[PDB]
Amino acid sequence: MSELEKAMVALIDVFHQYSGREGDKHKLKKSELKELINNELSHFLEEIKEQEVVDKVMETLDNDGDGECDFQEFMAFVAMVTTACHEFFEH
C-alpha cells in the first residue's frame, strides 16, 4: 500500500482506538475526544484542559447535533486541522 493509503488506514485506526473506549463504540464522546486531542494531536493543538474548550470543539465538529463526534465528523475535523497546518506552506 502506498504511504497515502497507509495514512488513511492510520486515521481509521486512531479513531477506533479512542471511539471504542466508552459508550458508543463508533463515536467519540467529549472525554474520548479530549484524550485523542491531548494524546495524539499534541504537536498541532494545545492541550485541552477546560471543559468550555472541549465543549466548543465538540460543538464545532458535531454537525448532526448528537453531542458526539462520529467518523465523518472526525474526518472533517482532521481535514480542518491538517488544512490549517498546511497553510504554513501557503505564502
Residues that bind a copy of itself (CB under 8 A): 1-17, 20, 25-26, 36, 39-47, 71-72, 75-76, 78-91
Contact residue for Ca ion among 24, 40, 55, 59 (CB under 5 A): 24
What does the CA dihedral 12, 49, 44, 33 come to, rounded to 10 degrees? 10
Q: Is 73 annotated as a binding residue?
A: yes
Residue 89: phi and psi, rounded to 5, are -80, -10
Phi and psi at residue 9, to the nearest 5°: -65, -35
5 binds, among a copy of itself, Ca ion, none (CB under 5 to 8 A by kind): a copy of itself
- Alpha carbon 6 to its chain's center: 18
State whether the Cα torsion 31-36-37-42 is positive or negative: positive
CB of 24 to a copy of itself, least distance (A): 11
Q: Which residues are annotated as a binding site for Zn(2+)?
A: 16, 26, 86, 91
Instruction: Could you list the residues known to form a binding site, using ranges.
Output: 16, 19, 22, 24, 26-27, 32, 62, 64, 66, 68, 73, 86, 91
